[PDB]
C-alpha cells in the first residue's frame, strides 16, 4: 500500500506527525514517488527540516532532475554535505551532464571534507582534460588519501600528459596511502613512465640516458632537479633524434659530475628546452653552450653560457 | 593608483594611531572609499587594474574594519562600513565587468569578492556581534554577491563557480551562526534565504544552459 | 478499503509509537493521497493539498479527522457542487482563525459530501456564501449551525 508504506518509512525515520503530514503535503503537491519520499526520509535521518527538504525537492523538480540524481541527494545527505551544497552539487551535476557515479564520487569527496567548489572545480578539470568516471573514482581515492585539491589537479594533469590509465592513478592513491608527497608521487609516475617507455625503445643510448637520469634522481634531493631529470628521461624516451640524445647525454655528463645545483638546474633546463624545441639553430647553440661549458672551467662562465642559451630557447 | 591607494591606507592608519573617535574614523573611511572609487573609475582600464582595484579596496576595507574592532566600536558602525565597502565594491565590480572579457580574470575577480565577504563576515563574528547583525550582513552579502553574479555571469561554468562561492559563503555564515549558538529559527531563516538566493541564481543559470 | 498489508504498515506505525488517532489520520491521509494520485483531477489534488496543509499546521484530532475525512470524501466524489462546497469550506477555514468555525465548516462540507440532496447542497452552499460574505464569527457560526442541524 505505497502511500502508507511511505508513511511507515517516515515513521521508522522517527519523523514528527505534523512533519509527516507536511512531507505528505509536499508529496501530494509535487507528486513525489515513494523512492523520492524515501530520499526525504533519509534527509530526515540526516536531520534536515521538512521545510528545507521541501524547498530542495521543489528545486529538484524545477531543475527537472533524473530520479537517480534525486536518489543520490540522499547519498550527499549521508555524506553530511551542507544543505545548500547538496543543491549546488545537484545543479552542478545537471549543468555538467555527468552520470550518478560522478555524484557518488562527489559523495566520497564530501566524506573526505572537500568543498562543493573544489568538487565542481575537480569535475570541471576532469571534463576539460577529457578524463573518465574511473579516473574520477581514483581521484576520490586521492581524496580518501587526504591529498589537497590543487595536488589532485596537478596529479591528474600530469597523469593526462603521461597518458596514464585509471589503475595508474589508483596506484598513485596507494602511494598517497603510503604518505608519499605529491612531488614524489609525480616523480615516481615520471620514472615509471620513462622506464616502461625505455622498454618500448630498444636503444642502448636512450637506456643509458634514462639510467643516468634515474641515478641522478636517486642521488639528488631537490624537487626541481628531480622533476627536470625525470621529465628529461620521459622526453629522451619519447625522442628519436641523435642531436637531442647527444645534448641530453652531454648535459648529464656535465651535471652528474658537477657538485653545484646551479649548473645542474641550468644544464637540465637547457636540455629540457632543447628536447622540447624544433629548431636546429637552437639545438646547435645549446650544443655550443655545452661545448663552451666543457672547454671552460669557471662555474660563473658555465652558468652564463647556459643562461644565454636558456634565454634564447625559453 | 597603488601609490594613492597606499596613501589613503597610511592616512587612515595614522588617524587610527591618533586615537580619533569611531565616528571620525568612519567618516574618513567613507570619504577615502568614495575617493578610492573615483580614482579607480578613472585609472582602471585593464584586467589587472580591476584586480588591483578590488585588492586595494578590499584591503582598505579590511584595515578599516580592523580599526573599528580594535577601538571596540558598536557593531552598528561596523555594519554601516561593511555595507559601504560592499556597495562601492559592487559599483567597481560593475565598472570592471565592462573592462574585463577573459574567463580566468572574471572568475578570480568574483572569487576575490567572495573572499572579501568571507573575511568581513569572519571579522564581524570575531568582533562579537549578535546573530541579529550577523544575519543582516550575511543576507546583504549574499544579495550583493547575487547582484554581482547577475552582472558578470555569461557562461554555465562561471555560473557554477559563482553558485559554489555563494554556497560556500552560506556554509561559512551558518558555521558562525552555529558557533555563536543562534536559534534553529534564525538558522532556518538564513538557510532558506541562501537556498532562495541559489534558486534566483538558478533562474539566471536557466539563461545559460 | 485498505488491504491487510496496509494494516501491517499501520501496525508498523504502532511499532513507531504513533497514537491511534494519529495512525488513523495517517491512514486517512495516505488513502486520500493514493486516491488523488489515481484520480487525475487537479481540483481534488488542490483539496488534498489544502487539507494536508491544514492538518500539518493545526494540531487537534477532531479538526484533523474532519479535514482528512472530507479529503477522502472528495476523492470519493465527482459533482462540482460538492467540490465547490469543500473548496469554500477550506477557503473559509484558511481565512478564519476560530476552531469552532473550522469544525462547523468542515462538518457542513462532510454532511454535504455524505448526503445526496440538492436542497441540502444549495442551503449548505448558501450558508457558506453567507459565512464568506459576512465578517462576524457569530453570524458565521449561526448560519453553519442551522445548515448542520438541517443536514445531520
Author numbering:
A (entry chain O): 1 to 314
B (entry chain b): 522 to 730
C (entry chain T): 163 to 314
Could you share sentences copied from the article?
Expandability over four different sizes was achieved with cage_O43_129 (+0, +4, +8 and +12 helices). The internal structure of the oligomers is clearly resolved in cryo-EM reconstructions for the first three sizes and in ns-EM reconstruction of the largest size; the distance between the centre of mass of the tetramer component to the centre of mass of the trimer component across the different sizes is 7.9, 9.4, 11.3 and 11.7 nm respectively. Views down each of the three symmetry axes (twofold, threefold and fourfold) are clear for each size (except for the threefold view in the largest size) with slight rotational deviations of the fourfold cyclic component compared to the design model, whereas the rotation of the threefold cyclic component holding the THR remains unperturbed as designed.
